[PDB]
Amino acid sequence: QVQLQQSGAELVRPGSSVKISCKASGYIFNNYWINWVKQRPGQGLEWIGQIYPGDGDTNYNGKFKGKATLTADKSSSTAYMQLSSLTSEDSAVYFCAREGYIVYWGQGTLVTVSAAKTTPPSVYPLAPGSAAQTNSMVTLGCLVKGYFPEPVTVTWNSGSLSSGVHTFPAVLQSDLYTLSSSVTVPSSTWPSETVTCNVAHPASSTKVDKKIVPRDC
Amino acid sequence: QFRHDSGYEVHH
Amino acid sequence: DVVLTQTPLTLSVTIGQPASISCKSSQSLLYSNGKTYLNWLLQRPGQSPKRLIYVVSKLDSGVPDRFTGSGSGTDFTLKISRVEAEDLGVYYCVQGTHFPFTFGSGTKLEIKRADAAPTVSIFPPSSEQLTSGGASVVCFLNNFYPKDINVKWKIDGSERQNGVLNSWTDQDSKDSTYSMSSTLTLTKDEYERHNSYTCEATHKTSTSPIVKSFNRNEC
Known part of the structure; x- marks a missing residue:
């Protein structure tokens, strides 16, 4: 079975950074795009960007350039998103998703930015x-x-x-x-x-x- | 969720 | 960026009735390979999103054929032939033809059903909490419809608002009802200055309040 296991809830002090993970299993990690999606409390969905683990290719929403950095560890089949210099606007649930003829989704990681x-x-x-x-x-x-x-x-x-x-x-x-x-x-x-x-x-x-x-x- | 056939496998 | 405009932004649908959501794009979604990357997602409260339809009209495996999609170029529609209680949530169109990928604003699907009166329950503070010097009195107003409801607290027969906080659930995926909690938070010392604690629910299903109460002297 395909599973995307995201890391647990985060508490981040204002101005600090966080790196959240998406551990994939059940498919060939190198062969599918991983997308990252933001859901602020009560708002719609936003696309952050994507990575193709096979070659490290990325595409970003310009809105998140300089806020989000996407990487992938091929050996551990884990995708990561680093979020820099956090403010309250970054408090949200972040999902990873595996693109494909079937799409699979992580359970989401809640990030709270607070002192x-x-x-x-x-x-x-x-x-x-x-x-x-x-x-x-x-x-x-x-x-x-x-x-x-x-x-x-x-x-x-x-x-x-x-x-x-x-x-x-x-x-x-x-x-x-x-x-x-x-x-x-x-x-x-x-x-x-x-x-x-x-x-x-x-x-x-x-x-x-x-x-x-x-x-x- | 955006471009289903953008990875390695495209049905053919 | 591609702007996706969904209409309507909210739906209230009776079980068994059909429904339709429109999604209109600011640009052609036809890609160079002949495909049109307009897809549809559903997100329930408490769940991750799921894809229902891809490239306009292809149905995801496991999704009921009650769901169909149509359209071309810039005008797209999601149709549900007969709505069931488990279809509630927020539906999004999303496009992958042009970078950056974008989402519609979402259409909230609510179920419309027969009116239902709340089942009201009141709970005194636990002995555990009182040992710590606190006293929360909790009232549940459960499984009612429609969602609009009001709660009033009476302490020794007199209305009280100080210290009351309310919370409402999202619509229930099985019975299509709503629930609400009302919590009166006191210190132990304040709780011990009164005897009768009463929660009163006002709802369209009754011309008078549904009332539950307890007395501090009755354990």
Whole structure:
């Protein structure tokens, strides 16, 4: 299978540089163009440029000349994009893509340009008040409070609880983000079957599994 | 995503 | 650079209805080899983009034949014969005939469905958070349609806005609904000065609020 594995979320101080990677597998690396695409928060898509690993040929959007530099390590089948002298306009998700009769895409790398400090989340359970009325279904959740930078991912029961899950976009205040995630399960299955939120904040190397238990005073 | 046949392989 | 103009910029389509997006180019997209490098992409919130159509009309493998593309020279169209819930997202035309390669501005496809009332849930602060001196009260307003909704907090019966922040999900890819969270953030000391915490949802599905509440003395 063709895969393009991009490097993880970045935090870059204003004026500094970053080099992000796109590790290719499942095809002949030298034979296909790799394109790089920018998506600023809430905006459309922009083309940065491309490299052909076989011979190192590049073509750039003039808008990114002197901001982006594209290289490729043939031996490790890895493409790189270096971004220089970053400002807030460079905060974005960057995708790599392999051109072809089938196109394949990396998962994206979020880059945050900021002088603020990395902060891990505090993860708290959301369980109904002990006197709340019981229904056929019960909604539970996790509160992921006070982290920086983006992103955070949340799953429930390692991804086995898929439908009935809502993870809300984070809100930003005082250089800290907060979000919550909700899940709904049959009331007959909780707490007899465990419900756990799996939270990851990659920029702080934090992974937390929080079991939701009924409140008990 | 832009020029599908721009690499080594072009169907023929 | 080639300017690609997409119309309309937003679509709201009922399940089963067709839809059409226009993409018009400022230059001929006919290349020297006889090919026209006008392609179509879709990006869902939370996902990487995917290509659906290449060189005007060729369908990517695995993409349903509900999607067709047509056009020539400077006028291009993407057509969906019948929309399904999983088609939501932003559709882009993109060109590779001329350097630099360019994208259209994107057309957001939203699903239109029957109205649905929110399911409201309220949660007291965890004992874990209270040990740290904080107290967040969370309200979920889940799986409603249409997207427009309002939330009001009442603490001991009196309206409160101080400390409330709201967040809305993107449209759900399966049931075409929206959800919203409302979070009231207090210190432990402030939380302990009140007993009744109430979240009230106002939505077109009811002439009066949907109300959920808890009392601090009931664990």
